[PDB]
């Protein structure tokens, strides 16, 4: 969150918050009653987002569900599939957080070191996460969007 | 001048390094009094705890002697 | 396996190396003491 | 632009081991010479 | 700046900007106009703040204009207040700001150690910092105020 | 460790529910009264001296303590235990802006008690102390902020206790 | 490092004036472009990988730098750039955040010349190949936010050569 | 630590006594499984990452494990798992081809059942892990080797239990 | 020994045995036996060769067999003669061990502080070893002889 | 640094060249000599203070460096000395085991010679030092590796010179 | 500037001793290789453009040195090159003949290398060069004064390095 | 030295490119701007003596520094005054007609700064009287090269300062 990343500062310095940072820890809570609703339609959209980013992944990269691929068999869809649920909702939590905290310290440092035992590919899912942030703006508005997209653009930023 | 005994286990949780990692999550060793709140701050900060700490050199007196 | 990365402060730029790069090096030779068994004790000790 | 310099040098970044680079690296960071162990190492290196 | 303490902040891991931070960068220069008029506002106002801000610190503190006083005489006075209208112009460049980053380089790191050597009482220039926070908060609106007030409240309290 | 958003959040990540209406509500309870924090915060770090100052004054000094013999003897003990008497304080505004004991049960309690029983440090004088610096810091922030510093406070004390 | 609003403190600080018109209205100026640069930024992010590929296949690569004596020969010499690069993006994506050349010549572009002389590494087709995403993020960024992106990379291209 | 070699030599040095007839057949016992030892160190070296990505499909993924709040949860804690797997792997060839536990003792399982403990590291479910590892390097290097390298698995497994 | 100087470089390396690495092992165990057979030749004849060295040591330093020397009774000469008994051994172990390990953790490390608080001549002792080097290479052959002169003088020059 | 080996191959890597007959050849050669070079490192490491022993009494000490006013004079600058000579025999040993006076350059020879010239030693007498050592190591080494030995310390005498 | 005899002359008379057998030794050494370097140097005065020719050929030209953005780019800095080649060629023909560097430490590393960092030439592409030149004049001279040329050619490179 | 047209061409050369539509917009970014600065300049030629005159009694005589104890006292120091101020005029005045700092960085700033310190000049009285010129000639030039004008003396000062 917001406040524990201002904190921990606080705390690496040995130091109170300061004068420019409880602006921003202010700034913070006055955009939460607009967000709040934000990620609460990502929320209840959750068992269809991914679903519908199933048939535009595969069908995008058909070497995933081929004999040769590392999701073939309906089990193995599977497990992508969950994979594509944890991580929207682990970027549904940091939007109701606000900084990358949520996704980084759970679900982010070490997706390297993860799959370098278990053979998913990186590539791939940097199509997966670029669909999901495309699929799930059309149900907010501009101003919403304007308010989801940044969230969105950080697992694609980051693993790359 | 006094030593803290003390032992302690402190977990990285940001970077998973990868050699010879086991002396450096668990161990007892003395620390100055000068150094010693410096020392196990670091603890709290890295997020492990500390299992005990023991005075060993010196009295709880104070007072003179506790120059170094 | 990533790239190394390491982590600045305020004041400087914070830097990342390829693996490949110093997988290719001298290979870091390096010098570990392992001592705290128990001080006071019970391991299997002697003096290593 | 560029108000001061620390002036260039000459680097030699290394590409691969080959094992002769790595054992001499190696007794260097010691700085002991040849163990006796080693010696064989080189042995039946040049032997093969 | 915030954008100094934001962009560091986010070179130090070799990352990309947050999207938690490409947020109150936004606040700031959604606040930039506001931050501009009030600074302009309290630069208008500058000899009337200092004037009456010293003659309320001379009235609270009647020892330091006394023969045994760090200020005592007409060019000792003038002095006190040049170090007030001092602290007005860095209370001001924090203002634009957006942080207290530029007064803190400027007039506080080193400021117990000036004052020591000169002999001036430091709870003196902290009660005419005081003084001129009340002049400076009566010419302003309340969110405005309240907004300048604060950094004077930084200066207080960093002058301790 | 952890705020209110945080331990929301993670509290529902452990068994992998998505923010439901309890979970909003604890979030919107959290952010509507954070503001009085920040107004509380702001004004404990403008006058934390005199915090520490007046519950020293009304706990600790003018006592046996201060005077040759107890644990507050010798300039470099007052100073030691006033360092403490900061450090308390700032984690309690630490814990207070959080909304969350977690960092007063990382950062101050994580060996703290077994370390002033190896020194002898008076814990009941540390307890007067630390509620002396509540009583302070609820007499400043004001009735908006009093309870949210009192609860953190009554926090560490038991936590010392 | 600076942005505009410290450049612009720093610069009437040593002569000790207030902010006057022209301050104003240079802290005035960068404030409406305040938009942009943001939108642009996170375009240069996300798109990054694809814009790094592009300009080297644009510029490094196809070339005498892929052949046997190349400075880009092998792979591990090409994995020294895309890093190389990554920086000239990164960096200059914090130049059209905070937009003044400050932090391009502090961290980046500072003894950079003397490194690359020690190292080999040719400094024109390092700039060449900062050309090149010039070209590629003027092209994805848009039409006006095209400006300003094209006056950091080419502060950055003139620095280095 | 030592090796067969060095204890044997270390046990007859606190005696003071020359090599006799005993400790040259103990010698002779090792020596006469030398190749053995060599050939089997480099299969498992060369197929480290395969070993340890059968074991982790055997053992502990597909379970609680890897769910919320499981041990294994998270990339940080699946990483870890992982890199603890192939510790194991790495100091058990290291005890194969030394030819005894005392690295094993001296390297791995000091402090480590406590570590664990302190951390809430399934223990039972290194076991099993060490145990897939086990029958997967036995499967591997053959009949000449396997119960050799089982053994020093096995003292893993009894050292952590 | 060889073994665990090899183990200890790698895990200080940080990766597994090297290929090269494992080529020391190989030799050690192809070596063995030869060494082996060098060890039973010279551990046969130990009270010989202390003997034969004792004559040399004794003509070459009549200071140590003199009134101000330390072997001087023959008490103390026995317990020169069980020293030089005792660092036959140590040799004899190094040869079977292929590195001085147990040498130098036996009889080399301190030694100096031995022999300086037993007040005894430390170039006395190095001319025994030499002697005993001289009568053992005449008992063996010279290719062996070579690595027996290796480690022979790798003490010679530790005690020095 | 670099050997014979390393040196032919990353010289014909950068051309791109395949290892020809030539190559080859020059790999018989550093080859065929290998077990001599290695005989004469061991006797080298064997009589190390040795040589170092006969180097100083035939070329250093009886002269005026030892008196007082020389630079050898005190016991500090007689032990810097005679540590100084040992590193130079034992870097002219890794450059006979490795075929090449790469490592010699790279780690001895820069700075040695403005060193010396900062701190006053003779590099005269530093020259004459180690032209003792290569006569006593090609008196301990033999016709085998006399040679071999003695052309790593004319280069050093050499880059000293 | 010194040669061998006047080095020797030298060194004897700082200690005010008559030349001895040593000294005679020493100056009949040098005088038995007099008429080789005196054939050796007449072959590269005449042949002195040829040599900085093609070693630039071999080490600098038809690289990114001569094209844009090079530091031997331009007509200027292409001269300036070929003339501190041709002082470095005949500066190694004058030490070859003195058999001493002393004319090199004295005329032209002194502050060469804090010139070339102050003018931003490459130091590792110079050192090249004369590495080139070393390799022209050794197939030049031929086995007779080969290594009597390149020690001076070596010197000249571990200075600038 | 080097202007616009000059930097925009040598910013091309260096990378090898061509004149681009870039360049080009820069090179009309200075031909539109011509008469403007032409303009600025013969005003600034013609009004010199004024300039300068008024700047002195507006920031420095009438004070300390004209009376005994001074650094303007003394008529040569005076002279030497006026003529410092006529060099930042007719510098800043050559910066504005040619669109570039660097003859400001290499003829005016270049060791002025220890130069000064050197002499005893006060640096803050020298900076406050380029203001003063600068005031001076934005009046005299008017709206049209004002902001032009007002940045090389900004240059200047900040240079200084
Ligand atoms: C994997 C099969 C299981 C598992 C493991 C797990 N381990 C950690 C953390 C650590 N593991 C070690 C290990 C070692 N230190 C040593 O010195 C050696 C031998 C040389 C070993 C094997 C240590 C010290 C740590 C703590 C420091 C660190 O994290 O690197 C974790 C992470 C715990 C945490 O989050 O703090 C985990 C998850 N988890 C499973 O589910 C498996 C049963
Ligand atoms: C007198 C010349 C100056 C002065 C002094 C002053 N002191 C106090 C209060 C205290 N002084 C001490 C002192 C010590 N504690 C130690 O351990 C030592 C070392 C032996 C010393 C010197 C302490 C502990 C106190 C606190 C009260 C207590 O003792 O319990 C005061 C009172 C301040 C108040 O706010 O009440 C004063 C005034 N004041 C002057 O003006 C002189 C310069
Ligand atoms: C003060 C109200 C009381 C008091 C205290 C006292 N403390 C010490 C010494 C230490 N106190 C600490 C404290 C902490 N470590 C932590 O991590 C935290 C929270 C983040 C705390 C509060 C530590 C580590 C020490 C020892 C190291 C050091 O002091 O640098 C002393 C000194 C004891 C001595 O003389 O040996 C004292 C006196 N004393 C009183 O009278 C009060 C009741
Ligand atoms: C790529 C387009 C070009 C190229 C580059 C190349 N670079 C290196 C090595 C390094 N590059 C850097 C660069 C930086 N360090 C910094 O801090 C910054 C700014 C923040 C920069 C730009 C450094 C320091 C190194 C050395 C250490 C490292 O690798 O990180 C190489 C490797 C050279 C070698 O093999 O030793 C290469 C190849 N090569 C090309 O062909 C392009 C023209
Ligand atoms: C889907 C777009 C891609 C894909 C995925 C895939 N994943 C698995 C298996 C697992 N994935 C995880 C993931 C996580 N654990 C965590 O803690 C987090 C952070 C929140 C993540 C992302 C895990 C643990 C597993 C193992 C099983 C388990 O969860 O218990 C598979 C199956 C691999 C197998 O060997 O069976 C697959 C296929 N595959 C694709 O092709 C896509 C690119
Ligand atoms: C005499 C009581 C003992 C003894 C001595 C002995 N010394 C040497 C040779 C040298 N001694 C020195 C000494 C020093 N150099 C210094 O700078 C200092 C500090 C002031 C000292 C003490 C040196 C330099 C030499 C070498 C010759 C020289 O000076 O040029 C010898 C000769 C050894 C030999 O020839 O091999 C001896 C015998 N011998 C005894 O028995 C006494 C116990
Ligand atoms: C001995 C035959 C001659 C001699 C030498 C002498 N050297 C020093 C001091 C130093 N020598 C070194 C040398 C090295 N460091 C390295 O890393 C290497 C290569 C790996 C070398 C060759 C250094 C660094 C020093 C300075 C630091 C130190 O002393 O360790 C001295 C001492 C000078 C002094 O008193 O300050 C001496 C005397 N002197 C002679 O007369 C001989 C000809
Ligand atoms: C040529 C192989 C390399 C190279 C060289 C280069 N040098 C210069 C300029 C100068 N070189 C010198 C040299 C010397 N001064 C001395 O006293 C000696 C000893 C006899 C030498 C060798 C000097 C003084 C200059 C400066 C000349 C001046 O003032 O203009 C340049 C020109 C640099 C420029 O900016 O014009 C160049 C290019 N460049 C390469 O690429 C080669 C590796
Ligand atoms: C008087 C007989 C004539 C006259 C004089 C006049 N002078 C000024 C102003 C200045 N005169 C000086 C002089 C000096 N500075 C020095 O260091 C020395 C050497 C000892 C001298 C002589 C200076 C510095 C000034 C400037 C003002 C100042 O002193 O601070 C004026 C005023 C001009 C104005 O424009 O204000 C005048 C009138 N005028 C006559 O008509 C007489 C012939
Ligand atoms: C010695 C080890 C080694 C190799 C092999 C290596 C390869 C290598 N292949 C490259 C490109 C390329 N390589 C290929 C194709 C192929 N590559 C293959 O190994 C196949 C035979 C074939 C496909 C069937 C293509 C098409 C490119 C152009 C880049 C692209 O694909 O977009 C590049 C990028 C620079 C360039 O374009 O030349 C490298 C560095 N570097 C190394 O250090």
Same mark, same amino acid.
């Given at each position: 969150?917001?406040?524990?990343?201002?904190?921990?500062?606080?705390?690496?310095?040995?130091?109170?918050?300061?004068?420019?940072?409880?602006?921003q820890?202010?700034?913070?809570?006055?955009?939460?009653?607009?967000?709040?609703?934000?990620?609460?339609?990502?929320?209840?959209?959750?068992?269809?987002?991914?679903?519908?980013?199933?048939?535009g992944?595969?069908?995008?990269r058909?070497?995933?569900?081929?004999?040769?691929?590392?999701?073939?068999?309906?089990?193995?869809?599977?497990?992508?599939?969950?994979?594509?649920?944890?991580?929207?909702?682990?970027?549904?939590?940091? !939007?109701?957080?606000?900084?990358?905290?949520?996704?980084?310290?759970?679900?982010?440092?070490?997706?390297?070191?993860?799959?370098?035992?278990?053979?998913?590919?990186?590539?791939?899912? !940097?199509?997966?996460?670029?669909?999901?942030?495309?699929?799930?703006?059309?149900?907010?508005?501009?101003?919403?969007?304007?308010?989801?997209?940044?969230?969105?653009?950080?697992?694609?930023?980051?693993?790359? | 001048?006094?030593?803290?005994?003390?032992?302690?286990?402190?977990?990285s949780?940001?970077?998973?390094?990868?050699?010879?990692?086991?002396?450096?999550?668990?161990?007892?060793?003395?620390?100055?009094?000068?150094?010693?709140?410096?020392?196990?701050?670091?603890?709290?900060?890295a997020?492990?705890?500390?299992?005990?700490?023991?005075?060993?050199?010196?009295?709880?007196?104070?007072?003179?002697?506790?120059?170094? | 396996?990533?790239?190394?990365?390491?982590?600045?402060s305020?004041?400087?730029?914070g830097?990342?190396?390829?693996?490949?790069?110093?997988?290719?090096?001298?290979?870091?030779?390096?010098?570990?003491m392992?001592?705290?068994?128990?001080?006071?004790?019970?391991?299997?000790?002697?003096?290593? | 632009?560029?108000?001061?310099?620390?002036?260039?040098?000459?680097?030699?970044?290394?590409?691969?081991?080959?094992?002769?680079?790595?054992?001499?690296?190696?007794?260097?960071?010691?700085?002991?010479?040849?163990?006796?162990?080693?010696?064989?190492?080189?042995?039946?290196?040049?032997?093969? | 700046?915030?954008?100094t303490?934001?962009?560091?902040?986010?070179? &130090?891991?070799?990352?990309?900007?947050?999207?938690?931070?490409?947020?109150?960068?936004?606040?700031?220069?959604?606040?930039?106009?506001?931050?501009?008029?009030?600074?302009?506002?309290?630069?208008?106002?500058?000899?009337?703040?200092?004037?009456?801000?010293?003659?309320?610190?001379?009235?609270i503190?009647?020892?330091?204009?006394?023969?045994?006083?760090?200020?005592?005489?007409?060019?000792?006075?003038?002095?006190?207040?040049?170090?007030?209208?001092?602290?007005?112009?860095?209370?001001?460049?924090?203002?634009?700001?957006?942080?207290?980053?530029?007064?803190?380089?400027?007039?506080?790191?080193?400021?117990?150690?000036?004052?020591?050597?000169?002999?001036?009482?430091?709870?003196?220039? &902290?009660?005419?910092?005081?003084?001129m926070?009340?002049?400076?908060?009566?010419?302003?609106?309340?969110?405005?105020?309240?907004?300048?007030?604060?950094?004077?409240?930084?200066?207080?309290?960093?002058?301790? | 460790?952890?705020?209110?958003?945080?331990?929301?959040?993670?509290?529902?990540?452990?068994?992998?529910?998505?923010?439901?209406?309890?979970?909003?509500?604890?979030?919107?309870?959290?952010?509507?009264?954070?503001?009085?924090?920040?107004?509380?915060?702001?004004?404990?770090? *403008?006058?934390?001296?005199?915090?520490?100052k007046?519950?020293?004054?009304?706990?600790?000094?003018? *006592?046996?303590?201060?005077?040759?013999?107890?644990?507050?003897?010798?300039?470099?003990?007052?100073?030691?235990?006033?360092?403490?008497?900061?450090?308390?304080?700032?984690?309690?505004?630490?814990?207070?802006?959080?909304?969350?004991? *977690?960092?007063?049960?990382?950062?101050?309690?994580?060996?703290?008690?077994?370390?002033?029983? *190896?020194?002898?440090?008076?814990?009941?004088?540390?307890?007067?102390?630390?509620?002396?610096?509540?009583?302070?810091?609820?007499?400043?922030?004001?009735?908006?902020?009093?309870?949210?510093?009192?609860?953190?406070?009554?926090?560490?004390?038991?936590?010392?206790?």
């Open positions: 969150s917001v406040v524990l990343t201002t904190i921990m500062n606080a705390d690496q310095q040995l130091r109170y918050p300061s004068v420019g940072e409880l602006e820890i202010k700034n913070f809570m006055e955009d939460s009653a607009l967000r709040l609703k934000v990620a609460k339609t990502l929320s209840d959209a959750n068992d269809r987002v991914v679903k519908q980013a199933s048939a992944l595969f069908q995008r058909p070497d995933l569900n081929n004999p040769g691929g590392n999701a073939y068999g309906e089990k193995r869809l599977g497990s992508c599939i969950r994979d594509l649920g944890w991580y929207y909702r682990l970027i549904t939590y940091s !939007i109701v957080a606000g900084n990358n905290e949520p996704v980084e310290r759970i679900g982010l440092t070490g997706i390297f070191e993860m799959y370098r035992v278990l053979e998913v590919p990186i590539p791939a899912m !940097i199509e997966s996460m670029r669909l999901l942030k495309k699929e799930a703006l059309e149900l907010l508005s501009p101003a919403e969007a304007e308010i989801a997209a940044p969230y969105f653009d950080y697992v694609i930023g980051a693993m790359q | 001048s006094r030593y803290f005994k003390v032992t302690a286990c402190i977990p949780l940001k970077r998973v390094r990868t050699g010879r990692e086991l002396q450096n999550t668990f161990f007892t060793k003395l620390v100055p009094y000068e150094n010693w709140f410096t020392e196990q701050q670091r603890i709290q900060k997020g492990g705890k500390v299992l005990s700490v023991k005075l060993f050199t010196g009295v709880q007196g104070a007072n003179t002697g506790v120059g170094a | 396996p990533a790239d190394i990365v390491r982590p600045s305020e004041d400087r730029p830097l990342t190396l390829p693996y490949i790069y110093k997988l290719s090096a001298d290979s870091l030779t390096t010098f570990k392992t001592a705290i068994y128990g001080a006071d004790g019970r391991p299997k000790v002697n003096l290593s | 632009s560029i108000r001061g310099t620390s002036g260039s040098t000459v680097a030699r970044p290394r590409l691969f081991r080959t094992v002769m680079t790595e054992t001499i690296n190696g007794i260097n960071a010691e700085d002991r010479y040849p163990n006796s162990g080693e010696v064989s190492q080189l042995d039946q290196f040049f032997g093969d | 700046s915030v954008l303490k934001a962009i560091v902040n986010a070179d &130090a891991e070799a990352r990309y900007l947050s999207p938690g931070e490409l947020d109150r960068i936004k606040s700031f220069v959604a606040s930039g106009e506001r931050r501009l008029r009030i600074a302009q506002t309290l630069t208008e106002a500058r000899e009337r703040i200092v004037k009456q801000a010293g003659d309320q610190l001379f009235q503190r009647p020892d330091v204009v006394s023969p045994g006083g760090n200020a005592y005489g007409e060019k000792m006075t003038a002095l006190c207040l040049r170090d007030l209208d001092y602290y007005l112009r860095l209370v001001t460049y924090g203002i634009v700001a957006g942080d207290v980053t530029p007064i803190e380089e400027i007039g506080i790191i080193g400021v117990k150690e000036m004052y020591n050597s000169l002999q001036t009482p430091i709870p003196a220039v &902290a009660e005419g910092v005081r003084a926070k009340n002049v400076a908060t009566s010419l302003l609106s309340g969110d405005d105020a309240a907004e300048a007030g604060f950094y004077f409240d930084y200066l207080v309290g960093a002058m301790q | 460790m952890q705020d209110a958003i945080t331990a929301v959040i993670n509290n529902y990540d452990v068994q992998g529910k998505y923010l439901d209406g309890a979970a909003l509500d604890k979030l919107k309870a959290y952010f509507t009264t954070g503001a009085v924090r920040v107004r509380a915060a702001a004004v404990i770090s *403008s006058n934390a001296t005199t915090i520490i007046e519950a020293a004054a009304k706990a600790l000094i003018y *006592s046996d303590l201060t005077r040759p013999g107890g644990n507050m003897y010798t300039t470099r003990r007052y100073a030691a235990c006033i360092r403490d008497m900061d450090y308390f304080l700032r984690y309690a505004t630490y814990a207070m802006l959080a909304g969350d004991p *977690s960092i007063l049960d990382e950062r101050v309690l994580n060996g703290l008690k077994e370390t002033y029983n *190896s020194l002898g440090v008076p814990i009941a004088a540390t307890v007067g102390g630390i509620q002396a610096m509540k009583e302070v810091v609820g007499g400043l922030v004001g009735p908006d902020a009093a309870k949210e510093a009192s609860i953190y406070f009554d926090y560490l004390s038991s936590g010392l206790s």
